[PDB]
Structure formats: structure tokens, C-alpha cells
Amino acid sequence: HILICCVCLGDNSEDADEIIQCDNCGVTVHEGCYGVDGESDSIMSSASENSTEPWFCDACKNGVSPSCELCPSQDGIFKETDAGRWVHVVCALYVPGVAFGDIDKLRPVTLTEMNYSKYGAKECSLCEDTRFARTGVCISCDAGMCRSFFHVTCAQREGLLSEAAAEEDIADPFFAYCKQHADRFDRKWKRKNYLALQSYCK
Amino acid sequence: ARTKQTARK
Ligand SMILES: [Ca+2]
Ligand SMILES: [Ca+2]
Ligand SMILES: [Zn+2]
Ligand SMILES: [Zn+2]
Ligand SMILES: [Zn+2]
Ligand SMILES: [Zn+2]
Ligand SMILES: [Zn+2]
């Protein structure tokens, strides 16, 4: 019933930044977390007298249920890369050296030789299926010199991903802490919203 | 789905 954004795990849905839902795969996301904010209503919407219109994420528009170049998870919402592959929005935000082509639409994603050289270089300490602990790219805990490594989506599941507020003026506002260094209150509500996101999509 | 902006205040 409650709508949760699968990128930031926030639950606020206002008229300016609405949490929307893909009508084929079911994922739910803030307009602003996916680059579809402030866009005009579709041409198909003139046919309806209803207040809502169908919407489809980019993977479904292309008829794929892709895998991510940067992690082993199959859930969540994706953006296409310049090479025709796919990455999670969340992985693109948190992995260093990965940037969005234009910030307004968050499209496309350009992955470099430097990104690919990090493949498998660290073992993800949170993978539940060790067969994948060395796929993709890990980030590390951002507390001091802590060298704890994990996939962005594995860290998301444990409620470890944080975003600084805009007023804080931190050039890279996306950061993560391992469980040893995390804010316990923040982990709690993020884990709670993650578990509700899993029950709603299924 | 996505609420049309005509239906947003
Ligand atoms: Ca990035
Ligand atoms: Ca970061
Ligand atoms: Zn969001
Ligand atoms: Zn979809
Ligand atoms: Zn990923
Ligand atoms: Zn992992
Ligand atoms: Zn740490």
C-alpha cells in the first residue's frame, strides 16, 4: 500500500516529486530519482479522463529484464549504458568514477575502462550467495580508513546507503558505512522501508 | 502508473 522509492528508500510522494510505478515490472521510484520529473503528460493520456497515465521504466521499454554491470542483483530499477548494457541507478550513484550524461534525465550512463578494471577486484562482504561476491564492483565504508567492501545493492539491503542533504554542500553526497560504523537509527528505517519494498513488488 | 500533471496542484 505504501509507496517506497527503490533508489533512495524514501517514502515521501508530493506533487513535485511523486513516487511512480512501472506498469510492467512493478518497480517504484521517485520521478526525481530517475530523471522523469517535470515532464509533460503522454500523448496516450489525452485518451483518458482519469487522473493517472501508464508509465514504464527504461528496461521494460526495451523489453529486457537486465543484469547490472556493477553488481549481481536483478531487482531494482535500471538505466542503459552507452554500450547497450545496463546498470542500477543506485550503483551508478554510489560507485566512484561513474557519472550521468545529463543530470536532469540521468541518461545515458558512460562506463570507462577504469570502471571495468575494478571488476571482481574486491570481495563483497555482504553477498548472501558467495558465488557472486566477486562479480561487479564494490564500494567501501566511508568512515575514516575502514576497508570494508560491499556491492551497492547489498549495502542498500542492509540499510547502509546514505545521502547528504543538499544544504550540507558535500560535493559527493552519496556515502555508505559498514554495520560497524553505521548510524543505528538510519539503518532501522532504511531496512524497514527495504522490506516493505520487497513485499509490495514481489 | 504516473499521475498526470494536469491532476497535480
Ligand atoms: Ca557515481
Ligand atoms: Ca560516494
Ligand atoms: Zn527516491
Ligand atoms: Zn519496468
Ligand atoms: Zn547494480
Ligand atoms: Zn554483494
Ligand atoms: Zn566501516
From TrEMBL, chain B:
Q: Which residues carry this modification: N6,N6-dimethyllysine?
A: K4, K9
Recorded protein name is Gene for histone H3 (germline gene)
- Lineage summary: Eukaryota, Metazoa, Chordata, Craniata, Vertebrata
Species annotation: Homo sapiens
| Superkingdom classification of source | Eukaryota
Which residues, renumbered to this chain, carry the PTM N6,N6,N6-trimethyllysine? K4
